[PDB]
């Protein structure tokens, strides 16, 4: 368990799931799909990547 | 009064019966152009549905018209006749003999 310290190292912070952020992202994806279809006159396909 | 591909993709995101009704209500040439751009399955389904079209209620027609009006975009001055191919040929004719040799080369290449 004992390790030497390096000032140029850092750790992670577990998991911070944000379901509300994902819902906002999906709603924004829908709105942006509509906007891009309106603008470019062609139907786009927007896929929300993993946060 | 719109481009075939744009209208095809627009009505492609609709129920096939609605697509068939719109195509029946559209111009024959425009509908034929739209149907040529559809996939085989959708095209066959539309052709089957058109062969068994029995009329639509006026309320449904009004709602469909309102939805189509809502789906409209900045279609004012849609498309524009500027040039292409012929203009490219004219430009090639104005470019040097060595340049037109390069032209034969690249055009054969594509």
Swiss-Prot record, chain A:
Q: Which domain of life is it from?
A: Bacteria
Cleavable signal peptide: none
Compartments annotated for it: namely:
Cell inner membrane; Bacterial flagellum basal body
Q: Which family does it belong to?
A: Belongs to the FliM family.
The protein's role, per its UniProt record: FliM is one of three proteins (FliG, FliN, FliM) that forms the rotor-mounted switch complex (C ring), located at the base of the basal body. This complex interacts with the CheY and CheZ chemotaxis proteins, in addition to contacting components of the motor that determine the direction of flagellar rotation.
> What is the protein name given in its UniProt record?
Flagellar motor switch protein FliM
**What is the gene name?**
fliM
Part of the whole protein covered: 34 to 84 of 334
Curated annotation (Swiss-Prot), chain B:
Q: Where is this site: Part of the EHPQR-motif?
A: 49
Coordinates of motif Part of the EHPQR-motif in the sequence? 14-17
Name the domain of life.
Bacteria
Q: Where in the cell is it found?
A: Cell inner membrane; Bacterial flagellum basal body
Protein family (similarity comment) = Belongs to the FliG family.
* Function noted in UniProt: FliG is one of three proteins (FliG, FliN, FliM) that forms the rotor-mounted switch complex (C ring), located at the base of the basal body. This complex interacts with the CheY and CheZ chemotaxis proteins, in addition to contacting components of the motor that determine the direction of flagellar rotation.
Identify this protein by name.
Flagellar motor switch protein FliG
Q: Which organism is it from?
A: Salmonella typhimurium (strain LT2 / SGSC1412 / ATCC 700720)
Q: What is the lineage of its organism?
A: Bacteria, Pseudomonadati, Pseudomonadota, Gammaproteobacteria, Enterobacterales
């Amino acid at each position: 368990d004992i390790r030497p310290y390096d000032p140029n190292t850092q750790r992670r912070v577990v998991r911070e799931r944000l379901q509300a952020l994902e819902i906002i992202n999906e709603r924004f994806a829908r709105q942006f799909r509509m906007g891009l279809f309106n603008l470019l006159r062609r139907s786009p396909d927007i896929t929300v990547g993993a946060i | 009064f719109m481009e075939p591909q744009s209208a095809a993709d627009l009505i492609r995101d609709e129920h096939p019966q609605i697509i068939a009704t719109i195509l029946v209500h559209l111009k024959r040439s425009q509908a034929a152009d739209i149907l040529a751009l559809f996939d085989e399955r959708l095209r066959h389904d539309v052709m089957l549905r058109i062969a068994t079209f029995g009329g639509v209620q006026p309320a449904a027609l009004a709602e469909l018209t309102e939805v189509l009006n809502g789906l409209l975009d900045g279609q004012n001055l849609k498309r524009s006749k500027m040039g292409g191919v012929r203009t490219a040929a004219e430009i090639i004719n104005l470019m040097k003999t060595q340049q037109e040799e390069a032209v034969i080369t690249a055009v054969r290449e594509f």
